[PDB]
Amino acid sequence: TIQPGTGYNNGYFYSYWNDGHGGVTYTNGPGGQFSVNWSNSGDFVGGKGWQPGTKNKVINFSGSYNPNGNSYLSVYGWSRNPLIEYYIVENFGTYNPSTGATKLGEVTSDGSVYDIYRTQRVNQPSIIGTATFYQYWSVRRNHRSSGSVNTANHFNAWAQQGLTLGTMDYQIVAVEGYFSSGSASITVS
């Protein structure tokens, strides 16, 4: 594993964070590749991409994703002003992150319908410190662990629905886990 933090590896921005509970290892590989191996983890998120992201990136990902418990595989990032945490969820484990959330529409992109949702985090950690902020979600109906994500289709549908993004901060393909186990190996471009 590498140390939790951010930086650049083989041309790609990376972010790896965990809550210190243990049980998760994150590795940077060649090019845009990263691996995650976890067993009875705590809370964590890791992956590769860009800092800053853009609102019209076509993100390619490929590999394997084998969660056992609560985990997501997503295009994941933030905007500033307004502060937004966003997800284009391509696959997940035992928990659909939109469970109980308000549905804000549908968008078709890259071979599947996605359902759109908005949630709110109240006094939670963020890229700017503790804050209350919205999260935007596109959740893919047809789960997969390789493909291409035309981010503009999502960001435009969100905007249409009143889910505005500010200036982009980082934008990665991320494996997220919450007290679960699994393995994953993903290459981004």
Resolution attained, angstroms: 1.1
Q: How many CB atoms lie within 10 A of CB 28?
A: 20
d(CA 32, CA 16): 14
d(CA 175, CA 91): 10
Q: Check 85, 90, 115, 169 and give the catalytic one.
A: 85
> Which residue is listed with tokens 């964070």?
17
76 annotated among ligand-binding-site residues: yes
Q: Could you tell me the residue range of the domain that residue 80 belongs to?
A: 1-189
Q: Check 176, 177, 186, 188 and give the catalytic one.
A: 176
Q: Report the amino acid identity of residue 82.
A: P
Q: Report the amino acid identity of residue 142.
A: N
How do beta strands 131-140 and 84-92 pair? parallel
Q: Is residue 176 annotated as a catalytic residue, yes or no?
A: yes
Domain count, the chain: 1
Question: What burial letters (b/e) apply to 141-175, b meaning 16+ CB within 10 Å?
Answer: eeeebebebebebbbebbeeeebebeebbbbbbbb
Give the torsion sign (CA, 4, 7, 8, 13).
Answer: positive
121 annotated among ligand-binding-site residues: yes
Question: CA nearest 46: which of 20, 15, 71?
Answer: 15
Question: CA nearest 15: which of 180, 149, 179, 174?
Answer: 174
Chain breaks in the chain (C to N over 2.5 A) after: none
Contact 77, 59 (CB under 8 A): no
Contact 166, 80 (CB under 8 A): yes
Q: How far is CA 122 from CA 49, 55, 72, in A?
A: 27, 26, 21
CATH number at residue 74: 2.60.120.180
Cβ neighbours for 129, distance < 8 A, ≥ 6 positions apart = none
d(CA 172, CA 87): 10
What letter does residue 120 receive in the DSSP assignment? E
Q: How far is CA 111 from CA 78, 89, 122, 140, 175, in A?
A: 25, 14, 34, 9, 21
Tokens of 102: 């308000």
Technique behind the model: X-ray
125 annotated among ligand-binding-site residues: yes
Cβ neighbours for 179, distance < 8 A, ≥ 6 positions apart = 21, 40, 41, 42, 43, 69, 70
d(CA 150, CA 10): 23
d(CA 83, CA 134): 7
Contact 28, 14 (CB under 8 A): yes
Calculated CA dihedral for residues 24, 49, 4, 88, nearest 10 degrees: -50
